[PDB]
């Protein structure tokens, strides 16, 4: 019952830049409320229209700040004020991006590997991230791992790729713990080529 959700571009947003929320439906609504939550959460309202098919409503967040940041869903409606909200739709991670120094993310043991072979992708930093997030290009979703220091006074996280299939051009960010929306530069792209 779920109206659809889709972050244009996506969900990472650099600072000051802006982004499309867009929630739409088989469903016909007239009334969509688009609810962050959290602390600061926040519901904003559009009239949007169907036309034919499919209902869209397309909500406008930025420039991208610290508090426009965190999880969002969107619920349909068919009365006005005050409505009576459809199921929610699934959330997305508004994410502000480029705003700490990059971290660094390298391959072991190489950034090729053979079909089912594993590869470990390893973010690494001396800021002093608490987590770190693995991007793989074209994926709307994250993996994250703590981040643990090391007597050397490096702060990172090792990620397995499991049986290597495809390859995949990837990139991390560091977080700290406090603001877990609210990420770093993107380290440089590795790309992972399978045999």
Request: one cysteine or more; charged letters at 15%; hydrophobic letters at 35%.
């Amino acid at each position: 019952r779920k109206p659809s959700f889709l972050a244009l571009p996506g969900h990472l947003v650099k600072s000051e830049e802006t982004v499309i929320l867009q929630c739409w439906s088989d469903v016909m609504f007239e009334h969509f409320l688009l609810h962050r939550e959290g602390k600061f959460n926040n519901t904003l309202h559009l009239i949007g229209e169907h036309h034919d098919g499919v209902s869209k409503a397309n909500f406008s967040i930025g420039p991208m700040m610290p508090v426009l940041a965190g999880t969002y869903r969107c619920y349909g409606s068919v009365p006005h004020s005050p409505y009576q909200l459809s199921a929610p739709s699934d959330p997305l991670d508004m994410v502000i991006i480029g705003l700490y120094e990059k971290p660094s993310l390298s391959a072991q043991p190489g950034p090729t590997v053979q079909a089912g072979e594993n590869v470990t992708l390893s973010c690494s930093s001396r800021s002093s991230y608490d987590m770190y997030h693995l991007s793989r290009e074209g994926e709307a979703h994250e993996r994250r791992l703590p981040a643990v220091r090391s007597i050397n006074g490096t702060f990172q996280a090792d990620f397995p790729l499991g049986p290597a299939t495809h390859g995949g051009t990837y990139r991390c960010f560091g977080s700290f713990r406090d603001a877990p929306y609210e990420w770093s530069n993107s380290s440089d792209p590795l790309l992972v080529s399978v045999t």
